[PDB]
Amino acid sequence: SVAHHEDVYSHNLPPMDEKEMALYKLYRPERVTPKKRSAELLKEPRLNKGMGFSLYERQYLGLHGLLPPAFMTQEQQAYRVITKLREQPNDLARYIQLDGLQDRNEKLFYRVVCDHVKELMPIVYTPTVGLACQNFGYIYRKPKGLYITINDNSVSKIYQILSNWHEEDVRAIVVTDGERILGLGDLGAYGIGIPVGKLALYVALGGVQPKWCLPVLLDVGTNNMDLLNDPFYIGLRHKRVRGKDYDTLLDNFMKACTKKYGQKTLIQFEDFANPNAFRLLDKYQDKYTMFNDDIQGTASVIVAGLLTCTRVTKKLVSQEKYLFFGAGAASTGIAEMIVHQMQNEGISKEEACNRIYLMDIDGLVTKNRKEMNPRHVQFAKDMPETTSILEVIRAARPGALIGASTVRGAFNEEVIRAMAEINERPIIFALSNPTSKAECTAEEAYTFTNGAALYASGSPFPNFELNGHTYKPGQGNNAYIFPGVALGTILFQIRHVDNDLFLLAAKKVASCVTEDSLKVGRVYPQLKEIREISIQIAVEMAKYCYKNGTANLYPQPEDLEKYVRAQVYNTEYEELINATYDWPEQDMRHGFPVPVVRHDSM
Amino acid sequence: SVAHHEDVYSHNLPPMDEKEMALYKLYRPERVTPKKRSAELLKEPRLNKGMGFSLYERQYLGLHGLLPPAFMTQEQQAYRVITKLREQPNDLARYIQLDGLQDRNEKLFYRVVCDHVKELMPIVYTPTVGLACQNFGYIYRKPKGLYITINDNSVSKIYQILSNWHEEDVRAIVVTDGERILGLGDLGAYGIGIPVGKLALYVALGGVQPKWCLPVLLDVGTNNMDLLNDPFYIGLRHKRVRGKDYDTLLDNFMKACTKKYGQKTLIQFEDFANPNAFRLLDKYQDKYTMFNDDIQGTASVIVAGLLTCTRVTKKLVSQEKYLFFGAGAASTGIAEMIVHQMQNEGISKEEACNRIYLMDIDGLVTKNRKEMNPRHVQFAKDMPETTSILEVIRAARPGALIGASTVRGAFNEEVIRAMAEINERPIIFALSNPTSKAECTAEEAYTFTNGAALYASGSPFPNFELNGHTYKPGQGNNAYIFPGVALGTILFQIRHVDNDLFLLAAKKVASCVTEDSLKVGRVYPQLKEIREISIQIAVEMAKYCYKNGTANLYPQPEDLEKYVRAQVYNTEYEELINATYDWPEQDMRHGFPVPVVRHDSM
Amino acid sequence: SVAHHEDVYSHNLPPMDEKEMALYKLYRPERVTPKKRSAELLKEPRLNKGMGFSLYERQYLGLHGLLPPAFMTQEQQAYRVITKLREQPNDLARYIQLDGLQDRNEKLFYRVVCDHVKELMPIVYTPTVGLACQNFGYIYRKPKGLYITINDNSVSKIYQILSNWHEEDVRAIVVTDGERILGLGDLGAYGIGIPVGKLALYVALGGVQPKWCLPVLLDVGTNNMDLLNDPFYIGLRHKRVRGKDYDTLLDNFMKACTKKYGQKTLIQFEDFANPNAFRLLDKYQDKYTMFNDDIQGTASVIVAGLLTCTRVTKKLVSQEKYLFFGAGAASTGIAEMIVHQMQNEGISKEEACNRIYLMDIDGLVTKNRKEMNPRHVQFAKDMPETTSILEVIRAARPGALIGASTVRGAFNEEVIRAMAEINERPIIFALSNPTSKAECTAEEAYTFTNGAALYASGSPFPNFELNGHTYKPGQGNNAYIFPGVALGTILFQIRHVDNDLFLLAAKKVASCVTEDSLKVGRVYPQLKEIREISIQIAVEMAKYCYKNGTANLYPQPEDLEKYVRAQVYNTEYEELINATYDWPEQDMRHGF
Ligand SMILES: NC(=O)C1=CN([C@@H]2O[C@H](COP(=O)(O)OP(=O)(O)OC[C@H]3O[C@@H](n4cnc5c(N)ncnc54)[C@H](O)[C@@H]3O)[C@@H](O)[C@H]2O)C=CC1
Ligand SMILES: NC(=O)C1=CN([C@@H]2O[C@H](COP(=O)(O)OP(=O)(O)OC[C@H]3O[C@@H](n4cnc5c(N)ncnc54)[C@H](O)[C@@H]3O)[C@@H](O)[C@H]2O)C=CC1
Ligand SMILES: NC(=O)C1=CN([C@@H]2O[C@H](COP(=O)(O)OP(=O)(O)OC[C@H]3O[C@@H](n4cnc5c(N)ncnc54)[C@H](O)[C@@H]3O)[C@@H](O)[C@H]2O)C=CC1
Ligand SMILES: O=C([O-])C(O)C(=O)[O-]
Ligand SMILES: O=C([O-])C(O)C(=O)[O-]
Ligand SMILES: O=C([O-])C(O)C(=O)[O-]
């Protein structure tokens, strides 16, 4: 136990001022002792350390004998996990092993994932998760998510379902109806793995407390005929509901979630069908603490890559011309975000649009097109119609070429060459996923520009070595933005998340790109830096939000950075046993304080 | 179970519009099913209904056989309780029976207390609770409060103690160091019953959810020699600590409470020593969601009585002159509140004070006094010194006479007569407690004014019948204010509670005084009306707070009154079993959705 | 938490040989750590030590802050309790305080009762419990018993009620239908306090583990018209059911209990109307581990008194003559036991029954009886019908006079004098309760005898000084017998309890009577010696039952006494935190 003149768990601390010490004690995480013991404790992923439990811990908590007689450090445990991970036959098996690890030892799970982020991120989420949902179907595991269906349509029915969730302090919810699992399509009730994986990244990359995360899948049916014909499908066996009923379920959902966990609850939409996703974002953006990563996150991270490029083309975003090959959800969202960013730079919206050109399956979007998307009206160009990328390039001489059109290798030598003729350092972004759909590989962009192109892709490409100069092409991964935006939003209870905040996040990502990477053609920070980037984003959001009074956390913490750093998740094992401490010796004595004569009996 | 086209627990409802229905479903309380069963459930006061449990409930929840084979309604149960209550030998025994009832069946406890508020309020709190703490010492009961001592001085040590409290959703805390238990003095660690009783009123009179309440007693020692010599004292056996250490404990306390339950947590100070209480209020008022009932509540409820009087003397508060016999904590607080109220009426602070005269043990407080309290500086009168109430009356001809000086019968016939000569309807308030210390009884005030005096007292006096005209003198009970102020503060997350809000509460109490009572000389509403008054106060506070942006609940509820009425505690027994409901018949079927050929075995 | 070469909780152990050490470790109680914390733990009487918890315990268990900042010793807590107990207005008030204590801190409850047995036994049970049930009605308390009614009449329905009981390891059950609460009568559902108090004594006086105890009240209705008319009554509001349905409810009860806890479960019947008491005993006695204290405990504790008396009259029971004034349940049961005791001493059931004379409202029970009770037939004497005890005395010349007839002063000077005439040390027992109904007081028994009378009563009488000699009359309290019989039965899983076992318990109590107590006319041991007596009875029972093969505990423990002493309840607080111990250093290291 601790001495009467000492505080609990305050040993071997760095020298601190009387003021610093107080601020440290105010912000620091306090020990939380569990109620569970023995097997029940070992079966709780948030408490279980496995063989990482010392002998004394095992005896005190009633775990002794239920675990093998070997004792390990978290590091030795992570070694065992990574070793077995790499011995796995394929990525799907690694996904299964990792999902199991999350259900076994949560601290270890994040330790391992954070330590090998570049190697494991594409397993936890990115592209393997969708493949796992499609191929495995119902995956055996601990209840780590909720299914809310069109047959539980009411605030009360949804409330009762949320009430079945173990944790009461839910602050982050990622929901999907499973209609547009990125790169796979409609997988219905099998899409539960998407919210799960997304939240795993909120924790691993953002620092968001795992107990605050709640993955949700809304089941209104599926239009995937293979599933409706599949005798092993476990979702509602009917086509997707879409009338007022669907809109009612979503309304009742947002209500129930906020009625249950509070209006400040962050609800993020993931993998909805493009049109539906945009509609929902427009309806809830200003009513709840919500955002859609596919729309706003994508737009944001690309703008971050472009902002970084600025430092090389020496031309501001408002001083550049952009050509998008493809004008669907991604391109349109990105373009709009670029417009906002240009306005915040001084230019008018009118002139902002003028520097943006859109091409779609029909060709260049011109003011004289039959029936175009409303969101394209302000980008339509007063120029001659064409289907030639080269003709559009020569006419507008853009400084940046961005492809978000599922067309493989549409950025051929002639196109690349063209760009590397009108520009000293051409910006080429091949965003279509996976790499097999990339408008062009990194190798092609550098070779056909003599290594002068500023390239970024949706899917990761190997390093390139041309004439001595080495190139490390970067990925425009949403993971650079959403974790930090989620963290800042949660910790400070930001009421609503708007473009300005995503722009702020994008500017922050750009500012973290080092010179050592910029000299290697890298316009994105290294993935292992997202945790730090996330914290920096969270603090920046606080500053911005307190100024316009949108942060609800009251009062503003005296030291934003310290508060945030004390709030983020710690992958290190913690003590589960209460700390003991002395009271002044005379006050801990047992027995009458004042003597009396003992009673007599029979 | 409910039909597939119906919602859970939505039967036999009043006709509702499509809009009304939605608002009802949004605000209404949702069913919460317990995890405990059998004896463990029966031992939880918030779940236990006792023999009020039906046979089906007892069988389902594993209670059957653990209770007698008799079934009752809550009404029949309340009858049994009230009957036994009145058969009790004295009030202390009733206090013990009621404390036990609170630990047995919480719903019943509040049912009984709310039904017989006038008869039971003085048992639960008011004057019996202090007597019980003094005479019984350690009272056997379920852990219904927390002890935080000077030896648990640190945010972490206090945090760990709060972590031992069962409920996590704490929103209301009433704390005392037990130094000034009203009318009894320093009772040290025995004062725990004060916060307990105060919170019981928050629930019964304000409607505050009982699970949000947390009673706390800070133990830094006691200066009561009888206790330090008592071999049965259970508190720290030393005199009260008072240096920076005491101030540190209180600071660490406010920090830990907010760090644990949130900055919006309402912490109310009760029964601290007058000077200490005022100091603490000044230090925390603007830093936390805190207030002191003894100071602000007292000042407030008296102002409410005076405001009501206005409707009879036809003279506004800013058009009246007040004379206080006694100038300690009560009188000074009341006077200051009257000053604020007069300013809000148009008059200047300078002129406001001019209408207020203070007399203390030395006599009239004049500008030419040796060493007077700072808070008296602005009330000191530029007039001749004297010790005669009659001389001061004749000189200022006040319209209201307020006594807050422990001197029994100091308002004698001559004094009363004087008042009923300068004024048609003299305002006489005898606030000293108990009745045995009252500056004058109601009977004396009416008799010596021919029944024209506007009388109110700190302690309740019987009804008076003079020359046909019946009189029902009222009590200036704090209970008219604090419940509603607490309710509004909690439900809307008001950041800070200032004079303006107490004034608003006082104006609301005044507005509820009916004509039927005003004709009987009653300047206070009937106690049984506090629940309704509390709700009206809560709503009014919301309106006021949303206008100046001090209410943190976001967003402002569409219907303030409905939101509040759906939030208040309901003394009626609730269902503890999950409501069941149908899904479309085809969706609830068990078995392969699509046929397959059965496998073969050996 | 402990060195790699040490065993957990084994410090300060008395010197022991390798074998003694082994047997000690084998029999000793092991620590049991609870799962509850904070208020939940504080709300469990079996765990809660209240302010007796040390500061470290409170911190570790999450109790800190929930208790006042004072630390006490158990002795200190017991003092606080006795003070308030003696400050109570009356015994009923002490009953309520004690009931609350058992619901608050179980170890303390038993520490207090055990420390002041003579003072508190009559509050816990004896005469106060019945009056509390009658006067208070449905008293507020933690669930501490089960109510099984005529409406839960099936093995499954009763099984589900038992399943609602917390403890799974129930081994002793005391049940009453509340029709005949001693001294008060039919109290219906209000009679649940009787089984509760009875079990409290099982623990306090017998050393029976508290977790094994289950109080039960069978509610089949009540004939008490006041209760039926009392709007506050909480039992079934209708007259008692007695047909086949009652018998079936009792059969299903016995079935359900044994199915739930096992055939080894001791089920003791208490305060049943005399007819049902005897019938049920006869029916279940050899089919279950069952017995009825009112019948067997009474007969046994009285035979124990008569046995101690043979030590002064130099006349073995088989060499004695007994006259019972009153021949109801009590007298008849005692007679049957005495007879059984006589048969075991060599005599035949011929002489035995011929050595016992009965009397009732209609005087002596003679062979010339019109419609006499079946159980009396073998005692009915073939002699002239009388009504005067004196005439019977002079005729049969009894060495002992036993009264179990609700008639006060039945034994007048004449009657007593006549006994002190025929016998040097006449045996006079006034068993009617309360004292206001005793056949005669001690003062009377001694005075009108010169102090030569071997007296005992059912209720307590103060010490009496005659001719400079102080007399201390004893009480034939069932508490000397049932705790021990229960302990032995439970511990060694004895299949059935029969006369021989009660007789064995009777002989043990008799043997613990010191010479000094005997010189003071006391024919029963001191109330404070019951815990020790119970342990001795259990050991004696095991020996007897292992010999005739009726003890199911297998195998016979090596040292019966050491075994029993390791099983009995301990009132001292125990550790609730796991003991920790080292492993070889090389084997606790973390990492590769
Ligand atoms: N979170 C996300 O949703 C992200 C998606 N991406 C990638 O962006 C790509 C596009 O996604 P979406 O905008 O949602 O699809 P989309 O269906 O909304 O838009 C595709 C656009 O490309 C045009 N297009 C198709 N074939 C063409 C051709 N031969 N020539 C010229 N224009 C053509 C279409 O007319 C349409 O405007 C995908 O490959 C996706 O993997 C990249 C980053 C993030
Ligand atoms: N929550 C509360 O604390 C409430 C208290 N009260 C009652 O108000 C009374 C006063 O309370 P406090 O202000 O806290 O006491 P206090 O000690 O703070 O003030 C008493 C005042 O009366 C004066 N005084 C004393 N004897 C006098 C005499 N013979 N002649 C003229 N002036 C005299 C003193 O100098 C002092 O100014 C008490 O009887 C109390 O029960 C009433 C309502 C609420
Ligand atoms: N556990 C127990 O039940 C114990 C009971 N007792 C006491 O034994 C006494 C009798 O109990 P029970 O046998 O159960 O009642 P009972 O009704 O079964 O027996 C009473 C007997 O006394 C006879 N009797 C009544 N008035 C008489 C009179 N004037 N003259 C002669 N004979 C008369 C009756 O005819 C009947 O045979 C009670 O006072 C009881 O408190 C003593 C020890 C234990
Ligand atoms: O074996 C493992 O996977 C690891 O060491 C663990 O303890 O979980
Ligand atoms: O008896 C009572 O006090 C009441 O009926 C209850 O059930 O608690
Ligand atoms: O006061 C008491 O009754 C005793 O000290 C206890 O802790 O229960």
What is the number of the ligand closest to the CA of A295?
1
Q: What is the 3-state secondary structure (H, E, C) of C510-571?
A: HHCCCHHHHHCCCCCCCHHHHHHHHHHHHHHHHHHHHHCCCECCCCCCCCHHHHHHHHCCCC
Tell me if A80 CB under 6 Å of ligand 4.
yes
Q: What is the dihedral of CA A306, A312, A315, A320, to 10 degrees?
A: -40
Q: Active-site residue C125, yes or no?
A: yes
Backbone dihedral angles phi then psi of residue B471, each to the nearest 5 degrees: -125, 135
Nearest to A477 by CA among A191, A198, A94: A198
Residues of B with CB under 8 A from a CB of C: 38-40, 42-43, 51, 59, 62-70, 80, 100, 104, 138, 140, 142-143, 146-149, 151-152, 160-166, 189, 192, 219, 232-236
Tell me if A270 CB under 6 Å of ligand 1.
no
To the question of domain A144-292+478-549 being in CATH 3.40.50.800, the answer is no
To the question of domain B36-143 being in CATH 1.10.3760.10, the answer is no
Minimal CA separation from C80 to chain A, in Å: 10
Token code pair at residue C152: 């839960």
Query: Taking CB atoms and an 8 Å limit, are B235 and C63 in contact across chains?
Result: no
Catalytic one among A125, A246, A261, A480?
A125
Token code pair at residue B209: 């959810």
Closest residue in chain C to residue A58, using alpha carbons only: C580
A425 in Cβ contact with A416 (< 8 Å):
no
Of A8, A593, A595, the CB nearest to B157: A8
Rounded-to-integer distance, Cα A47 and Cα A230, Å = 38
Rounded-to-integer distance, Cα B139 and Cα A6, Å = 33
Helix A329-343 vs helix A298-313: crossing angle, to nearest 10: 60
How many Å is the maximal CA-CA distance in chain C?
A: 101
Q: CB-based contacts of A87: which residues, under 8 Å, 6+ apart?
A: none
Half-sphere CA count of C576, side-chain side, radius 13 A: 25
C480 in Cβ contact with C511 (< 8 Å):
no
Rounded-to-integer distance, Cα B54 and Cα B46, Å = 17
Token code pair at residue B76: 């029949």
> Which technique?
X-ray
Quoted resolution (Å) = 2.0
Tell me if B105 CB under 6 Å of ligand 5.
yes
Rounded-to-integer distance, Cα C544 and Cα A212, Å = 66
Minimal CA separation from B231 to chain A, in Å: 5
What is the number of the ligand closest to the CA of A292?
1
Rounded-to-integer distance, Cα B220 and Cα B242, Å = 8
Query: Taking CB atoms and an 8 Å limit, are A580 and C73 in contact across chains?
Result: no
Ligand 4 center from residue A104 Cα (angstroms): 9
**Residue to probe by mutation, ligand 2, list B361, B393, B457, most atoms within 8 Å of CB:** B361
Rounded-to-integer distance, Cα B456 and Cα B475, Å = 6
Of A60, A72, A593, the CB nearest to C590: A72
Query: A-chain residues within 8 Å CB-CB of C35?
Result: 35, 37
Q: CB-based contacts of C349: which residues, under 8 Å, 6+ apart?
A: C339, C343, C378
The kind and range of the H/E element at A121 are helix A117-124
* Cβ burial, residue C348 (10 Å; 0-12/13-18/19+): exposed
A80: three-class secondary structure by DSSP: helix
A289 in Cβ contact with A266 (< 8 Å):
yes
B/e letters for C8-32, b = 16+ CB within 10 Å, e = fewer, are ebeeeeeeeeeeeeebbeebeeeee
A80 is in an annotated binding site: yes
CATH class (in words) of the domain with range A293-477: alpha beta
Rounded-to-integer distance, Cα C50 and Cα C43, Å = 10
Rounded-to-integer distance, Cα B471 and Cα C386, Å = 81
Closest residue in chain B to residue C62, using alpha carbons only: B164
B416: three-class secondary structure by DSSP: helix
Closest residue in chain A to residue C119, using alpha carbons only: A602
The beta strands (E) that lie in A400-450 are given as 400-403, 427-430
First CA to last CA distance, chain B: 43
Q: What is the dihedral of CA B230, B231, B233, B238, to 10 degrees?
A: 70
Residues in chain A: 602
> Taking the CB of residue A57, how many other CB atoms lie within 10 A of it?
18
* Cβ burial, residue A443 (10 Å; 0-12/13-18/19+): middle
Rounded-to-integer distance, Cα C529 and Cα C474, Å = 14
Query: Taking CB atoms and an 8 Å limit, are C60 and A578 in contact across chains?
Result: yes
Token code pair at residue B336: 């200051």
C58 is in an annotated binding site: no
Of A25, A578, A593, the CB nearest to B231: A593
Domain definitions of chain A by residue range: 1-35+550-589, 36-143, 144-292+478-549, 293-477
Q: Decide whether C144-292+478-549 matches C293-477 in CATH topology.
A: yes
Cis amide bond preceding C555, omega within 30: yes
Nearest to C81 by CA among C106, C107, C51, C108: C108
**Interface A-B: count of C-beta contacts within 8 A:** 100
C369 is in an annotated binding site: no
Nearest to A538 by CA among A572, A508, A581: A508
Rounded-to-integer distance, Cα C387 and Cα B511, Å = 88
β-pairing, A356-360 vs A363-364, is antiparallel
Half-sphere CA count of C197, side-chain side, radius 13 A: 27
The beta strands (E) that lie in B270-355 are given as 289-292, 322-325
Long-range Cβ contact pairs of A457-464 (< 8 A, separation 24 or more): A457/A429, A457/A430, A457/A431, A458/A430, A458/A431, A458/A432, A458/A433, A458/A434, A459/A127, A459/A433, A459/A434, A459/A435, A460/A122, A460/A435, A461/A435
Closest residue in chain A to residue B233, using alpha carbons only: A593
Give the residue, by CA position, lying nearest to ligand 6 atom 5: C77
The gap from C-alpha A212 to its chain's centroid, in whole angstroms, comes to: 14
Cis amide bond preceding B434, omega within 30: yes
Which single residue is written with the structure tokens 């399943």?
C163
Q: CB-based contacts of A89: which residues, under 8 Å, 6+ apart?
A: none
> Taking the CB of residue B56, how many other CB atoms lie within 10 A of it?
10
Q: What is the dihedral of CA A81, A86, A92, A95, to 10 degrees?
A: 30
Rounded-to-integer distance, Cα C515 and Cα B303, Å = 83
Rounded-to-integer distance, Cα C474 and Cα C456, Å = 5
Query: B-chain residues within 8 Å CB-CB of C188?
Result: none
Any idea which fold C1-35+550-589 has? arginine biosynthesis bifunctional protein fold (6.20.310)
Query: A-chain residues within 8 Å CB-CB of B231?
Result: 592-596
Of C79, C528, C583, the CB nearest to A602: C528
B529: three-class secondary structure by DSSP: helix
Helix B244-261 vs helix B155-162: crossing angle, to nearest 10: 50
Rounded-to-integer distance, Cα C68 and Cα C84, Å = 19
Rounded-to-integer distance, Cα A81 and Cα A109, Å = 9
A602: three-class secondary structure by DSSP: coil
B67 in Cβ contact with B58 (< 8 Å):
yes
Which single residue is written with the structure tokens 């719903």?
B107
A402 in Cβ contact with A429 (< 8 Å):
yes
Of A7, A554, A584, the CB nearest to B154: A7
**Interface B-C: count of C-beta contacts within 8 A:** 121
Residues of C with CB under 8 A from a CB of A: 1, 33, 35, 37, 52, 54-56, 59-62, 69-73, 76, 79, 82-83, 115-119, 527-528, 577-583, 587-592
Backbone dihedral angles phi then psi of residue B209, each to the nearest 5 degrees: -60, 125
B80 is in an annotated binding site: yes
Rounded-to-integer distance, Cα A365 and Cα A349, Å = 18
* Chain C neighbors (3+ CB pairs < 8 Å): A, B
Ligand 1 center from residue A174 Cα (angstroms): 23
Long-range Cβ contact pairs of A418-423 (< 8 A, separation 24 or more): A418/A390, A418/A393, A418/A394, A419/A393, A419/A449, A419/A453, A420/A448, A420/A449, A420/A450, A420/A452, A420/A453, A422/A393, A422/A394, A422/A397, A422/A398, A423/A313, A423/A399
Ligand 4 center from residue C555 Cα (angstroms): 45
B134 in Cβ contact with B92 (< 8 Å):
no
B436 DSSP 8-state letter? G
| Number of DSSP helices (H) and strands (E) in chain B, helices first | 24, 14
The beta strands (E) that lie in B131-229 are given as 146-149, 172-176, 213-219
What is the number of the ligand closest to the CA of A439?
1
C293 DSSP 8-state letter? I
The kind and range of the H/E element at A25 are helix A18-27
Rounded-to-integer distance, Cα A203 and Cα C229, Å = 68
β-pairing, A289-292 vs A266-269, is parallel
Q: CB-based contacts of C72: which residues, under 8 Å, 6+ apart?
A: A590, A591, C50, C51, C52, C80
Backbone dihedral angles phi then psi of residue A171, each to the nearest 5 degrees: -130, -15
Tell me if B181 CB under 6 Å of ligand 2.
no
Rounded-to-integer distance, Cα A451 and Cα A425, Å = 9
Nearest to A94 by CA among A136, A52, A43: A136
Query: B-chain residues within 8 Å CB-CB of C68?
Result: 138, 147, 189, 192, 234-235
Rounded-to-integer distance, Cα B80 and Cα B154, Å = 47
The gap from C-alpha A602 to its chain's centroid, in whole angstroms, comes to: 76
B207 DSSP 8-state letter? -
Catalytic one among B107, B198, B260, B507?
B198
* Cβ burial, residue A393 (10 Å; 0-12/13-18/19+): buried
Rounded-to-integer distance, Cα B244 and Cα C377, Å = 91
Give the residue, by CA position, lying nearest to ligand 2 atom 19: B328
Which single residue is written with the structure tokens 């094992």?
A573
A484: three-class secondary structure by DSSP: helix
Catalytic one among C125, C471, C524, C569?
C125
- What does the DSSP assignment read for A530-562? HHHHHHHHHHHHHHHHHHTT-B-SSSPPS-HHH
